[PDB]
Amino acid sequence: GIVEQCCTSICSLYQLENYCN
Amino acid sequence: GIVEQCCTSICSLYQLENYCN
Amino acid sequence: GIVEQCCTSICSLYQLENYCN
Amino acid sequence: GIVEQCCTSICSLYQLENYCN
Amino acid sequence: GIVEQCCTSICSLYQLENYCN
Amino acid sequence: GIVEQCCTSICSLYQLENYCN
Amino acid sequence: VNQHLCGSHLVEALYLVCGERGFFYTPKT
Amino acid sequence: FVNQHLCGSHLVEALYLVCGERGFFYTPKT
Amino acid sequence: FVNQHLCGSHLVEALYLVCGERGFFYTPK
Amino acid sequence: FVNQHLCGSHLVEALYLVCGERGFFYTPKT
Amino acid sequence: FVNQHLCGSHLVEALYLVCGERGFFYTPK
Amino acid sequence: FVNQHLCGSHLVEALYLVCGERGFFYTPKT
Numbered sequence: 162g163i164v165e166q167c168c169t170s171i172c173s174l175y176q177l178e179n180y181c182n
Numbered sequence: 183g184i185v186e187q188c189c190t191s192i193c194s195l196y197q198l199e200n201y202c203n
Numbered sequence: 204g205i206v207e208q209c210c211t212s213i214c215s216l217y218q219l220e221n222y223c224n
Numbered sequence: 225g226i227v228e229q230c231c232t233s234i235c236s237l238y239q240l241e242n243y244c245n
Numbered sequence: 246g247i248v249e250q251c252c253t254s255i256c257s258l259y260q261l262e263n264y265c266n
Numbered sequence: 267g268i269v270e271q272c273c274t275s276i277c278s279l280y281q282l283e284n285y286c287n
Numbered sequence: 288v289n290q291h292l293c294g295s296h297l298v299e300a301l302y303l304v305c306g307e308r309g310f311f312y313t314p315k316t
Numbered sequence: 317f318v319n320q321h322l323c324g325s326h327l328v329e330a331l332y333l334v335c336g337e338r339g340f341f342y343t344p345k346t
Numbered sequence: 347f348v349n350q351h352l353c354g355s356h357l358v359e360a361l362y363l364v365c366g367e368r369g370f371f372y373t374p375k
Numbered sequence: 376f377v378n379q380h381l382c383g384s385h386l387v388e389a390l391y392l393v394c395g396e397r398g399f400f401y402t403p404k405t
Numbered sequence: 406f407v408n409q410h411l412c413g414s415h416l417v418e419a420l421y422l423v424c425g426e427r428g429f430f431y432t433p434k
Numbered sequence: 435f436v437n438q439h440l441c442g443s444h445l446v447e448a449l450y451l452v453c454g455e456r457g458f459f460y461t462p463k464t
């Protein structure tokens with residue numbers, strides 16, 4: 162999930178958008 | 183300014199990108 | 204919702220806890 | 225103090241409240 | 246107090262240093 | 267740059283001021 | 288803009304209050 | 317882990333910005 | 347609107363930066 | 376004006392995220 | 406890396422949230 | 435690279451405060 166993905170590599174705003182509702 | 187544009191109404195991410203290098 | 208409930212007057216920690224999963 | 229107590233293991237808001245006036 | 250002093254007109258760094266220990 | 271100077275070790279206010287316009 | 292600024296602080300507060308539980312943020316009325 | 321705690325604080329700020337009106341669930345254990 | 351609360355959040359951050367190792371005191375009074 | 380001061384803080388954070396490796400100038404005056 | 410400084414910034418935010426009308430001191434050490 | 439990403443967020447907030455009406459230039463580049 163988001164922590165595994167984005168706390169070990171920088172997520173772009175597009176990658177973050179994947180987690181929106 | 184960015185202030186007059188974006189502190190008086192909400193700027194989209196795309197509008198903000200105008201102030202990037 | 205939370206903006207109506209918590210941006211006009213300050214929400215307590217108990218009120219904020221309403222939004223926890 | 226608070227840095228030693230709370231900067232490697234996460235302090236709860238209860239543990240943190242101890243540092244309040 | 247800091248809220249009266251600094252929440253309408255902007256406090257400088259020097260003004261803010263008044264509230265250091 | 268600022269990331270090399272100021273993320274490796276803490277920059278003072280004065281050092282940060284170097285990067286102002 | 289006021290609601291936008293408030294919401295940023297709300298999410299930070301929810302993050303701390305809720306911890307491991309996580310939270311649901313929606314601006315939906 | 318405090319490092320992960322600090323990262324997540326920034327994640328949810330970024331989600332707030334990106335998601336806009338959609339909002340988001342933050343589910344750190346997923 | 348929660349403006350004093352929001353202001354205080356930013357004030358504490360500013361004090362943290364300005365005051366360094368000394369630390370600071372915050373009172374909303 | 377403190378209201379603008381607070382807003383600008385959030386603006387800079389948003390520019391930081393949007394602009395990525397590009398970085399940005401923040402120049403109030405305009 | 407400035408991790409302790411970054412931790413303290415978030416600690417003060419958390420104290421701001423949890424503490425009440427008498428406020429708090431931040432004294433890292 | 436996340437450590438530097440998180441640090442940079444705090445750096446920009448600090449520059450915002452320190453630089454006042456001058457503003458600042460944030461580059462991550464070396």
Ligand SMILES: [Cl-]
Nearest residue numbers: 322323411440
């Ligand atoms: Cl951080």
Ligand SMILES: [Cl-]
Nearest residue numbers: 292352381382
């Ligand atoms: Cl604000």
Ligand SMILES: [Zn+2]
Nearest residue numbers: 292352356381
């Ligand atoms: Zn704010």
Ligand SMILES: [Zn+2]
Nearest residue numbers: 322411440444
């Ligand atoms: Zn941080």
